[PDB]
């Protein structure tokens, strides 16, 4: 409904110290059908997967790193925390028909690929245009897996847009962006695109795809996000 899913503001860890991120839910309860997502943000918005649905560590994800439903929470654990740690953890939920994120927990850390979604760095449109985002995937079998869609405004939150299944051509759009995202695909080249129209300044942003698919971990591999700027 109006969910919002909300996360520590800030933990200060060092290295060996165990770590309890939490992420709960304004309907009073995260249960096993959120699918919840853990990702990690670096600087540069450099965006890694560490858990999904629930409690899957994925591949490559360091073993200091678990997550599972504990009460009426979400819990990311980092059992031996490391200095490279230090970033911003994100947990995401699916309420029947969308993602939300929650505002992201900042970890300080004191004591300081095969697969690849390819994301032009930059792109300039002029208010009232539309502009095209492409996002190409290697490594991978690009139809089995959704390309989701998400964006990340200066100094805010992430939103979900939306995401495409390429082999039943199945799309599911945010009601926040149905009227401003368009989403395809191209399978011969494993292209996925999104579509910005009526644009103004407001979407000024960085836009990322990362891959999913039905009981997958959602958000594993993210694209390096295209920072648009609408101006004149």
């Known amino acids: 409904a109006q969910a919002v899913v909300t996360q520590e503001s800030a933990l200060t860890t060092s290295p060996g110290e165990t770590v309890t991120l939490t992420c709960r839910s304004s309907?009073?309860?995260?249960?096993?059908?959120?699918?919840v997502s853990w990702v990690q943000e670096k600087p540069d918005h450099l965006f890694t997967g560490l858990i999904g649905?629930?409690?899957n560590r994925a591949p490559g994800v360091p073993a200091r790193f678990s997550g599972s439903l504990i009460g009426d929470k979400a819990v990311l654990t980092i059992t031996g925390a490391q200095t490279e740690d230090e970033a911003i953890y994100f947990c995401?939920?699916?309420?029947?028909?969308?993602?939300?994120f929650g505002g992201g927990t900042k970890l300080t850390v004191l004591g300081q690929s095969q697969v690849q979604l390819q994301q032009p760095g930059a792109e300039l449109a002029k208010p009232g245009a539309s502009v095209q985002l492409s996002c190409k995937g290697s490594?991978?079998?690009?139809?089995?897996?959704?390309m989701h869609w998400v964006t990340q405004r200066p100094g805010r939150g992430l939103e979900w847009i939306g995401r495409?299944?390429?082999?039943?051509?199945?799309?599911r759009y945010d009601e926040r962006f149905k009227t401003k995202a368009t989403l395809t695909v191209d399978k011969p080249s494993s292209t996925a695109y999104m579509q910005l129209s009526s644009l103004t300044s407001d979407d000024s942003a960085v836009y990322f795809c990362?891959?999913?698919?039905?009981?997958?971990?959602?958000?594993?591999?993210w694209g390096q996000g295209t920072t648009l700027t609408v101006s004149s």
């Open positions: 990362a891959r999913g698919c039905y009981g997958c971990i959602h958000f594993d591999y």
């Open positions: 490594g991978y079998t690009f139809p089995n897996y959704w």
């Open positions: 495409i299944d390429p082999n039943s051509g199945f799309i």
């Open positions: 309907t009073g309860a995260v249960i096993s059908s959120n699918f």
């Open positions: 649905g629930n409690k």
């Open positions: 995401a939920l699916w309420y029947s028909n969308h993602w939300v």
